[PDB]
Amino acid sequence: MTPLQEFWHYFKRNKGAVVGLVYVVIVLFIAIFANWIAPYNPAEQFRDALLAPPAWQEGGSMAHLLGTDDVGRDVLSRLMYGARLSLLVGCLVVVLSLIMGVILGLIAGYFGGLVDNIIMRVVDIMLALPSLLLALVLVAIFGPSIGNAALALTFVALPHYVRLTRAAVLVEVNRDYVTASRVAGAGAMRQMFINIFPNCLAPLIVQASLGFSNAILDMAALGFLGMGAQPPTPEWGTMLSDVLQFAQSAWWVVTFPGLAILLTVLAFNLMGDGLRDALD
Amino acid sequence: LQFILRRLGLVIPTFIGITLLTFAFVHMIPGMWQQYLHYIWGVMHGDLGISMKSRIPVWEEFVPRFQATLELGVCAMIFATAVGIPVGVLAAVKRGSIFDHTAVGLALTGYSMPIFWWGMMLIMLVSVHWNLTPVSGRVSDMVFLDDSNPLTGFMLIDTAIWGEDGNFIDAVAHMILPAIVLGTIPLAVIVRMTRSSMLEVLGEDYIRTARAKGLTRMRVIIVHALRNAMLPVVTVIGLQVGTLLAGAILTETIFSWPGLGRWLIDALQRRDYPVVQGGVLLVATMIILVNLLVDLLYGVVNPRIR
Amino acid sequence: LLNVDKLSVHFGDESAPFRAVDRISYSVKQGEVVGIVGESGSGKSVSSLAIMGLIDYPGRVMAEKLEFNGQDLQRISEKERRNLVGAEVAMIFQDPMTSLNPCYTVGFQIMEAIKVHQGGNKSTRRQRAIDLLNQVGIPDPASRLDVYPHQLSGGMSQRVMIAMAIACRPKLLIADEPTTALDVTIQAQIIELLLELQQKENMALVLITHDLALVAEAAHKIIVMYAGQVVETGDAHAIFHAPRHPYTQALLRALPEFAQDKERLASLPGVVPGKYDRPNGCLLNPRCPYATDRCRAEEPALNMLADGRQSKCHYPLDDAGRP
Amino acid sequence: QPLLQAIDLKKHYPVKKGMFAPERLVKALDGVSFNLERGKTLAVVGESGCGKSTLGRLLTMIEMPTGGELYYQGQDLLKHDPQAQKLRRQKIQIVFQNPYGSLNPRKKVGQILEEPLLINTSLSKEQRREKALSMMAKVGLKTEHYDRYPHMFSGGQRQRIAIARGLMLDPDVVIADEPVSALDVSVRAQVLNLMMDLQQELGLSYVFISHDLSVVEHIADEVMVMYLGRCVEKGTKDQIFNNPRHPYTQALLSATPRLNPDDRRERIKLSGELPSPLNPPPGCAFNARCRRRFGPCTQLQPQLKDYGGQLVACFAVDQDENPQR
Ligand code: SF4
Ligand code: SF4
């Protein structure tokens, strides 16, 4: 088998991985085509049916399938537009932080010396606080908005990929083939990006899935605490920000947004389990 | 021993850095060489500032809330550790069993779980619908303790030593749900690292040597494998006790608990920057001290370090 | 002492097993030294791990007869297997660095080996450990007990392995490629130590190696293995003067020792059969210089020759090296 | 003029016990010298820690020396100058110990063989392909292997790719760091044959670093024996293998097994483990283990001397030759 073929072959071995993949695909589909598939606009108010139960409970109706929120706004519409923002910010946070983290990690791992010491020192400053507290401090300083949250989450995600890329590169640079290409005369840029990096891939393609899982939980965390996303907008964490008094009166408002976070993050941790399994 | 001098040599640069960063967050973002030495001179005298939402010194607001956070974090870690490690050992010994699958499956669930939402569901099921447990606070509104006694401020110790018969029972009642929700994540993590480390160690040649001596299966697992599989478990444990503050900021607001997380997030929402400026320095100092103690312990348990 | 008949060890799915050991049969007398030799695919070690019970569930062990000291090993209560392993059979393994537990002092690891099979007295067991470390030639036996495995050199670590194996007065000892990780002047000492213990205790010894020259000194009987099968067996002097099978002839003509100065060495063409490419008939048939139609149609029996040797060939080789 | 010449090559690694103590020198190699000739094999033999794997790293410019001189054809090879950097890489090349760790896992075989041409030469794509296929045919790999990854080759075929990679720049000296040690008996033979063939065809010289004296006996033209970073005996293949005179060589040869019963004319025993390079003995490095120890051997370090062509670093051989002492 070719390396791709062999990868997929092993991947299929894991049923959980498969199912997770399926669910991921589904949510992506939802996200992309939200506009068309959603039953109502996510800002619209049906003031005739405030806190209407889901369609299968005795008080509900088939018009509003998962019921309505306090202001008479439709939960299935809000969840599907929330899938859109949750995957959008997930992609942005993972792609920007993985680009910078690979580069700073390759530079720190290959050159050693003062350049290694200074990069790893500044990483250990920003890991001194737990990630969410540093993201909250940054979003407090620069003001709560969806964009400012995403750009705080890139900064606190970055040190984990720097640290793992360095660990992969130090396990790599002492191998004989990196020395063989140095005896043949390869320059520093060639050694890192054309000889070392293809082997550092494997350890990191699992961290992309952990990255999505953490970024969605951190978005949901910022949103629940009233930071980042703001109340008019359909985002799964902010939907749960003011809900606790409904624990007696309306179980759907509290259950469904968190169920959707759970599912999506579970799905991506299933990717990580599968990809890690499939690369050995 | 050269290893603790080595670890202090990495700690000092990071401590220096967080004092410079926390000075920058006090000199800028209000409401230079000579001014840094001054600010530090204030920190070492305990003058961390006076809060804006009420005019109490930040250190006098901190100490009672650090105590209320430590007790909850200790219960969450006892629960995690106690439950976690046995499960992870069992899972690896029973690889491929129903149990094995169950362990992994649950583990995944917990590790992928939004911790704030899980608190609301446990409140809704256990406290609101089935009425088995209390919904909020550290201890019930009808409990108070006689301030003439030398109370510690750890409510679960103080109500064991003093007060009416029923107060202790009520202290625990309030503790179980916060401990279980906070400890979920740690539990999950531990289980995964223990199972992984055990399946690495049960493949090592020294376990083949243990079997070749005729040792009983329980003695190969507990004396030979688990002794070495605990070395990774000590490191992960040290990471968990860093993330308990992020867990606490999310759970502590739901249960209305009088801890440090509710105080920090209220200060961030209210722009009470003196509480944030003092709180960041103390939380960073705590996490550095706990990392240094877990690194020192790792040095005692791993004989390659002596 | 040890009596093996039709031992087979299969790995993987029962529609198409990897036959890592395939219908082998041999016996070890009391006080005998037996060498097992073969190249990397040969299955030599798997035959011995199967006696100990160190094969895990992906592998399956079956035998017509696996008698040890008059005790059947196929249907033995686990308790009794424990009783046997470490006290009548013992084993030395390939890597001397990873074979000792890194977290316990070597005194704990010897005093444990004594505890499971003999008396428990702390003083008595420490005394027995000091006697054992004298017996394997440690420089300062009393101070070495408090030393961790990462502080020992490769040679010192393998002496501690022999001290655990010899602890309870064993009757058979298996050395699975003991010295291949070690320097030449350290190898010579460990093999002399095993042969000195063999002569002093009258115990049997099984050596597994790829180095034909090492068993040429040490062994009384040599067994040669190819592709999981036994292919020649005989007395250790004659087996390398008149080889009765094409594989031992080819394996010797590939040795530098059997060649002049700077002259080309012989070799057989092609790789060892794996799980996918098992030929019909004789397993050496793709490679063998003397092959004929019968060698493809029929699996050769392990024939016994008039001189007392055994060869798994339809045409066993004459005293001049020809069919 | 010698093809490659080394005068007093040495390497001291400075090591630190901890913050509380001075630095000290691990003298991993301490004044080796040789004259490698065109179309000849120089064999470097010794047990682990003797410095043989440092000499391979020095001569291939993987690490720089801390003294002495290395000349190729009368030109200095240890200058920093770019014109010497071309000569270094074109003329001297390496074959490594481990086949599993010396080919890059993610690159195709064609890629691995063309990379040296792409970095050093000006050859075109087609040209590079042509030269890679020609080298694979010379080394014994079929054309259809060109686009395979190294993880789908046997250990013998991996050392074939590693030898093919060395030969690309048309080298004069190929340095072989334990090249046949990981391989089994039929594959060793094969590899050896290939090597001999290439020697005979291209006119290479080998620096053969190994501890398998059996092989050495078969391959070698000139042999050098090392102990704790110094050369202790040097001479012709025949000389050393037929008439060894340093006490360590007598102990090392008699400790190797021999299949033929007549070869092991006497058995000699050392009764102790190797000195650590971190704490060298006071005098001769073999003084702790030597059958022949004598008053001078604790106080002074022996020096190589000619005793009839053979070079022997031993005061007792000196006295056997020189009774006046
Ligand atoms: S049986 Fe036939 S193929 Fe097998 S070794 Fe003998 S001659 Fe060769
Ligand atoms: S110099 Fe002395 S100690 Fe060294 S090898 Fe010669 S006789 Fe032995």
Author numbering:
A (entry chain B): 16 to 295
B (entry chain A): 2 to 32, 62 to 336
C (entry chain C): 3 to 325
D (entry chain D): 10 to 334
Paper passage:
The DppBCDF structure was determined to a global resolution of 3.2 Å. In the final model, except 30 residues, i.e., the periplasmic “scoop motif” region that connects transmembrane (TM) helix TM1 with α3 short helix in DppB, other residues in the DppBCDF complex are unambiguously resolved. The DppBCDF translocator assembles to form a rare heterotetramer with DppB and DppC specifically interacting with DppD and DppF, respectively, exhibiting a pseudo-dimeric symmetry perpendicular to the membrane plane. In the complex, TM helices (TM3, TM4, TM5 and TM6) of both DppB and DppC converge to form a substrate translocation pathway, yet its periplasmic substrate entrance is occluded via hydrophobic interactions. However, on the cytoplasmic side, TM helices (TM3, TM4, TM5 and TM6) of DppB are well separated apart from those of DppC, generating an inverted “V-shaped” substrate translocation pathway open to the cytoplasm. In line with the inward-facing conformation of the two TMDs, the two NBDs, DppD and DppF, also adopt an open conformation with no bound nucleotides observed at the interface. Apparently, the current structure snapshots an inward-facing resting state of the DppBCDF translocator. Notably, the two ATPases, DppD and DppF, in the complex, each binds a [4Fe-4S] cluster via their respective C-terminal domain, consistent with the crystal structure of the isolated DppD from Gram-negative bacteria Thermoanaerobacter tengcongensis. Consistent with our structural findings, DppBCDF has essentially no ATPase activity, even in the presence of dipeptide substrates such as Ala-Ala (AA). In the resting state, the substrate translocation pathway of DppBCDF is inward-facing open to the cytoplasm, sealing the membrane.
In Gram-negative bacteria, the full Dpp transporter is composed of five subunits: two integral membrane proteins (DppB and DppC) that form a translocation pathway for substrates; two ATPases (DppD and DppF) that bind and hydrolyze ATP during transport and a periplasm-localized SBP (DppA) for substrate capture. The Dpp transporter is primarily responsible for importing dipeptides but also capable of inefficiently importing tri- and tetrapeptides into the cell. Different from those structurally and mechanistically well-characterized ABC exporters that solely consist of two variable transmembrane domains (TMDs) and two highly conserved nucleotide-binding domains (NBDs), the ABC peptide importers require an additional substrate-binding protein (SBP) that captures peptide substrates and delivers them to the translocator for function. Unlike the reported heterotrimeric Mycobacterium tuberculosis DppBCD translocator, the E. coli DppBCDF translocator is a heterotetramer, with a [4Fe-4S] cluster at the C-terminus of each ATPase subunit.
